[PDB]
Design a binder for this molecule. Structure first.
Ligand SMILES: NC(=O)c1ccc[n+]([C@@H]2O[C@H](COP(=O)([O-])OP(=O)(O)OC[C@H]3O[C@@H](n4cnc5c(N)ncnc54)[C@H](OP(=O)(O)O)[C@@H]3O)[C@@H](O)[C@H]2O)c1
Ligand SMILES: NC(=O)c1ccc[n+]([C@@H]2O[C@H](COP(=O)([O-])OP(=O)(O)OC[C@H]3O[C@@H](n4cnc5c(N)ncnc54)[C@H](OP(=O)(O)O)[C@@H]3O)[C@@H](O)[C@H]2O)c1
Ligand SMILES: NC(=O)c1ccc[n+]([C@@H]2O[C@H](COP(=O)([O-])OP(=O)(O)OC[C@H]3O[C@@H](n4cnc5c(N)ncnc54)[C@H](OP(=O)(O)O)[C@@H]3O)[C@@H](O)[C@H]2O)c1
Ligand SMILES: NC(=O)c1ccc[n+]([C@@H]2O[C@H](COP(=O)([O-])OP(=O)(O)OC[C@H]3O[C@@H](n4cnc5c(N)ncnc54)[C@H](OP(=O)(O)O)[C@@H]3O)[C@@H](O)[C@H]2O)c1
Ligand SMILES: Nc1nc2c(ncn2[C@@H]2O[C@H](COP(=O)(O)OP(=O)(O)O[C@H]3O[C@H](CO)[C@@H](O)[C@H](O)[C@@H]3O)[C@@H](O)[C@H]2O)c(=O)[nH]1
Ligand SMILES: Nc1nc2c(ncn2[C@@H]2O[C@H](COP(=O)(O)OP(=O)(O)O[C@H]3O[C@H](CO)[C@@H](O)[C@H](O)[C@@H]3O)[C@@H](O)[C@H]2O)c(=O)[nH]1
Ligand SMILES: Nc1nc2c(ncn2[C@@H]2O[C@H](COP(=O)(O)OP(=O)(O)O[C@H]3O[C@H](CO)[C@@H](O)[C@H](O)[C@@H]3O)[C@@H](O)[C@H]2O)c(=O)[nH]1
Ligand SMILES: Nc1nc2c(ncn2[C@@H]2O[C@H](COP(=O)(O)OP(=O)(O)O[C@H]3O[C@H](CO)[C@@H](O)[C@H](O)[C@@H]3O)[C@@H](O)[C@H]2O)c(=O)[nH]1
Lengths: 344, 350, 350, 344
């Protein structure tokens, strides 16, 4: 008997996690938010218009969480639901605390209230944003935390409330400290999908210029379809441990723009400084990228690089998709997307 | 100088309200929730390929009716002359399973918004519309219902809206804030949410016409509603704020029809005649011309309670606002069904 | 088997309710807030040096009406047969400055508590009393007020209590939960909170008698209330739960008196006769025998709104519960004033 | 112009902080909770039945915080209000998160909403509970955190949201990482005041036995009347920095019981093990102390010892009251308390 309950099933990781578990025969349950429109576009192809059952819920409604967990009696819980955009968190700090911080507590409390403490396995979606102003290079499980945003602080709270439940009630509960993972389902608001969509529409004559913030930030980028599997591996372990999941390669936002444009035939050369910097196509002389301070963050995370030695040894997990292939896939997918539908 | 703040601008009423105010030259601001997907489909046409008139006149801000700081920051930065509080969890069945959330957004949320106005010192310079609902009448106390018939809610949705109604009135009487309640009966349109009975029928009848679906099920077929067109009703919201004094108004059509009748007429626009067979939960609707059964009953679309004899008397609105509904039941069904065929023909999702 | 869960057990009504149920052999549980000081003064005598009867029959638990988990855990562990929801922010003036908090505790909090009962599967085995209030009548719609006169709240306190009233009724009608609203008019006692008009007068008149104070100030002297004794009224709460069927009841005295009259009579028990001089905010009350002025008016004890002609008709309670009030206005003043002299004589703080 | 706003003014530290600032001429404002009874017993002697003004409020009511801070326009803010009992936090984790965690954010947000970011100085009451399972001995400002309770996790959130406001908006805001501080006004529920009150009533014939939990925990105990002053010193500094405040001496709960009883003439000798351990008076053979598991904590903080070298150098602050004098003062004060009033 394998029954999984996924929060934030409509997001990126949730949609891949649902396919993965479904393929392994699991019965998959998910908590979706009421919306005045449709909000299930990533998972609607899993209906068989079956083995996946959706329930209305919210990480701020204590009664609904108890009702669902008692009705479903899951054997695995994945808490992926959250307000996940670091920038939006600066102007939405209260809601972000209520959902990302207190919401993790509400869910753990529901497991204890239903009496499933000893029969459930609980995965928390932690994040490299805990390292913020990094205290070691690279970052591993033992590196001291130092968050840099209202989103970082909420997740830091969520990390330790999970540790506290494991240590105090022997709940099998783990923190997945995953670094950036992207995909053709990545939200349009994140820098990698913002670039890939923009470059794609430029190549099709649907757009001429788009604006970014800090070009000089460096990220460790992996593929979300690999990292979901590491979440499952963590709950198959014999002891509940915490793990870092990352690629170990570093690249700049600048490089990501360059490689993306390269896949449409254009070579970017930069001119100017700071918020007056621009990106011009060497071949046409057309300007396609400008900078605007409204995409900067009051306190930035400058450099991130994960060391997943522990996960490689204890889980036999390794990433299969590298930086270059990631850019090629996203740019290519958004071309086919925007070619058949320019409103996408 | 006319600048509007709209909560719930992505929903049915808000999108039509945005269009209405932008056409009159207003500057329109809306609050939208952060989402892991696009959630602006209803208003996308206004800031993508808009008319030369009203090109840069709509601005959107991330917020939530449970986040007190973000409301203060938006209201203070926008400094509006009119506020329309249309944001809410609006499904009546879902409120039975989501009662606490529905209370925090529909009830306390109204109070958070008024408190923001008082905090920013705009009490005397802003005009405030509250989205009330015939659901306040629950167990109806008069037939028909008018502004003075006493309330009696029958759901967590009604109770929350009942709190919002009285908190809005209190700010009016205590602080002389210009604040009105729109007591609106059911209103639909081609943009209605798929989870509401009318759009559920119209979308399925469409998909049956194109060979994309065979059969769908409803709950209580003998339920009756007072049904108007949302595009007409947003106009009454604006009139209520143009009134010399803040008063509450019922907005309705005064004609009542059954969901069973809605189904029959919908199928008529697709060439099919329904005859009902069977009783109770085994009742089914079959097509006369093909013999194929297209409508079944499923007990899970009932609700713990039910709202009885709704019929609006908007005499007051006729006199003091000179407003009357322009669209009738027949045309509402006709328009909705036609619209969903054209939509589902070009794309089989939604 | 009779076990009670009381929210707000440290306040006036709860302490007297604890005494009443313990005397009948009930097992009594209460929810108390964490505090940086002692906050159990009203019920301390019940678990410190108690009578041989009812020695180990009261247990206290840390909780809060905004903490959903703690309510579930307490209700599940106690498994009560009767629940009395008396916890609330109960000051009407303070609710104008504390409206959001008052909404979360007085309105949403009632819903959290009922939801706990449904979550624990006790819907069919528990009996639920809700502390309603004549404040629901706000702008009174009938004189006197009875169970059927329509509501019209005038404060954030009233609005919140108005939400709690209807959410309790909804659980009754939707799920057949045994749930009642006690519509109680003002009730006082030697344990009333110092911030309420009666105890404010009685405590100051005492301190003036002992040379500990010279003068105090009130707000609206011409306000009128319907005033009963809390010890009588807790008894009506219990009767409402003993009824064969769940019904709502008004509980009041039906006689109305003014705060001005309350002051005059209070001073009479201390040997002093008041004569009023001056008008409006410059009105003062002077002692006839000494010439010394003891009562002044201060505009800051008014409220943004005011509640008008309160008078309870509890005919229904007389018939179906056989309950009548035992204490009258004269004895209430007499008892309160006497009690505060004895208290302030032995200790000059409170 | 010196105007201070203190949250949790009715608590221990608040009452001493109010005297301290009042003596320096400050205008002192405080936020008190509505109570059905009196809750101002620690500060009521500061009325002059003046320079101290109380306002109704709560760290969970966003509108009331803005109204107060705008009305008062303080130059110094001390956020001392919180649900402060570690044990109670295990069964009150949600309320404790809302107040101790999110409440700190609500107050910072109010400062930004009123436009006082550049004209206010903000003190956060942090705590040695951040060190929990200590990662170094002794603990200093740079020691990695590891909280051990729902109270620890909420404060860890509050620490970093304060750091984020300082780094992102240049708010003069500091974390006081204060270790245990006791006094005759210490809450009755904490181990030091529980002991001193109990020993006192035993010496007066009002009590025979009382129950404790883990006797073998070790704490760094200082006097609250010293530590309030360090809070003021931190806001007189030229740069907003974080500081540890502690004594550097360690002692067990066991020792604290022994010394306390010594000051009434009784010598305690222990018998038994674990939850069957008892404390008997060598002179009379009467048992006065027993152990009960309901005072244990699911995850304990075993050893705590502060190193306030940074505060000594940069603030010229040092503790004036040592462990022994602290016990003598508390026991003596509760004797005089209970002698003149046995209900105290
Ligand atoms: N990386 C980290 O690891 C996780 C996976 O990230 P991702 O990139 O897949 O994020 P993805 O973009 O954001 O999806 C976030 C998910 O959380 C849901 N969610 C947000 N607020 C919620 C609430 N109050 N109640 C219930 N669900 C809520 C969202 O629902 P909607 O679809 O309705 O927005 C969505 O399903 C995240 O937690 C992130 O912090
Ligand atoms: N009648 C009025 O209109 C409703 C019925 O028809 P309708 O078309 O207006 O309703 P509707 O289409 O269901 O739209 C409800 C709107 O409220 C928004 N909303 C829901 N919860 C919110 C929250 N916590 N904070 C801010 N906004 C929130 C929704 O955003 P989403 O688009 O993200 O759902 C949406 O824009 C009634 O409830 C009443 O309000
Ligand atoms: N009439 C009923 O009784 C009240 C009027 O007279 P009364 O004597 O009953 O009222 P009261 O003496 O003012 O007592 C109110 C009670 O409610 C408690 N309370 C307040 N907020 C709470 C919260 N968030 N969670 C849990 N308990 C909370 C108070 O605890 P504290 O003692 O800590 O204030 C107190 O026990 C009305 O409001 C209505 O409830
Ligand atoms: N040591 C740390 O440093 C600080 C000083 O500790 P201490 O020993 O003096 O604590 P003390 O025992 O607890 O006092 C705590 C204070 O915080 C107040 N408080 C609690 N919850 C509140 C809320 N929701 N809204 C407003 N005020 C609230 C309490 O009011 P009440 O008096 O009404 O309980 C009290 O004034 C604490 O934050 C502690 O964590
Ligand atoms: N979004 C965005 N970021 C920009 C832009 N211009 C520059 N950036 C920079 O691009 C970097 C990466 O930004 P995002 O893709 O927004 O993500 P993130 O801050 O690294 O957040 C993601 O990573 C964590 C680990 O997966 C997640 O925890 C988090 O939820 C989120 O998915 C940041 O340094 C940001 O400043 C822009 O226009 N938009
Ligand atoms: N949604 C739905 N309703 C069904 C179904 N079968 C029967 N019904 C009945 O159809 C009627 C109308 O439901 P909606 O049209 O679903 O809701 P309302 O309960 O009519 O709610 C609308 O009215 C209020 C005021 O007009 C609004 O407050 C609310 O947000 C919403 O717009 C109700 O009697 C309901 O029982 C079904 O499959 N789905
Ligand atoms: N508290 C107070 N009230 C004053 C004062 N001067 C005049 N009043 C008037 O005295 C009347 C009674 O006030 P409380 O007795 O202060 O309040 P209520 O507003 O009467 O509230 C009580 O009644 C409700 C139902 O009986 C309860 O819901 C509420 O909790 C409380 O017990 C009101 O008309 C108030 O304006 C003053 O100095 N203080
Ligand atoms: N309270 C209590 N503690 C007991 C008992 N028996 C043993 N202890 C142990 O005594 C130690 C100290 O307990 P407390 O005095 O309750 O305080 P604390 O957990 O150290 O908490 C205080 O210290 C922090 C730093 O000042 C503060 O942050 C926190 O709010 C609180 O004031 C803990 O290890 C606790 O397990 C008992 O009966 N009661």
């Amino acid at each position: 008997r394998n029954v999984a309950l996924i929060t934030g099933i409509t997001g990126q990781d949730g949609s891949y996690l649902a396919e993965f578990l479904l393929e392994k025969g699991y019965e998959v349950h998910g908590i979706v938010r009421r919306s005045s429109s449709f909000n299930t576009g990533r998972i609607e192809h899993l209906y068989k218009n079956g083995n996946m059952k959706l329930h209305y819920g919210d990480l701020t409604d204590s009664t609904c969480l108890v009702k669902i967990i008692n009705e479903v009696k899951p054997t695995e819980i994945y808490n992926l639901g959250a307000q996940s955009h670091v920038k939006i968190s600066f102007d939405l700090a209260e809601y972000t605390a209520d959902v990302d911080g207190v919401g993790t507590l509400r869910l753990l409390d529901a497991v204890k209230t239903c009496g499933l403490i000893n029969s459930v396995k609980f995965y928390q979606a932690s994040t490299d944003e805990l390292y913020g102003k990094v205290q070691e290079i690279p970052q591993k499980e033992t590196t001291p935390f130092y968050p840099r945003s209202p989103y970082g602080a909420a997740k830091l709270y969520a990390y330790w409330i999970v540790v506290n439940f494991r240590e105090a009630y022997n709940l099998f509960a783990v923190n997945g400290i995953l670094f950036n993972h992207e995909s053709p389902r990545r939200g349009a608001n994140f820098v990698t999908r913002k670039i890939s969509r923009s470059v794609a529409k430029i190549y099709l004559g649907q757009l001429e210029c788009f604006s970014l913030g800090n070009l000089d930030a460096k990220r460790d980028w992996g593929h979300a379809k690999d990292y979901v599997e590491a979440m499952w591996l963590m709950l198959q372990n014999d002891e509940p441990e915490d793990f870092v999941i990352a690629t170990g390669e570093v690249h700049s936002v600048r490089e990501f723009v360059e490689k993306s444009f390269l896949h449409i035939g254009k070579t970017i050369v930069w001119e100017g400084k700071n918020e007056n910097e621009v990106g011009r196509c060497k071949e046409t002389g057309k300007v396609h990228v400008t900078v605007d301070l409204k995409y900067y963050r009051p306190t930035e995370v400058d450099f991130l690089q994960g060391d997943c030695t522990k996960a490689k040894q204890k889980l036999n997990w390794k990433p299969r998709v590298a930086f270059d292939e990631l850019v090629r896939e996203m740019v290519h997918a958004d071309v086919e997307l925007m070619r058949t539908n320019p409103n996408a």
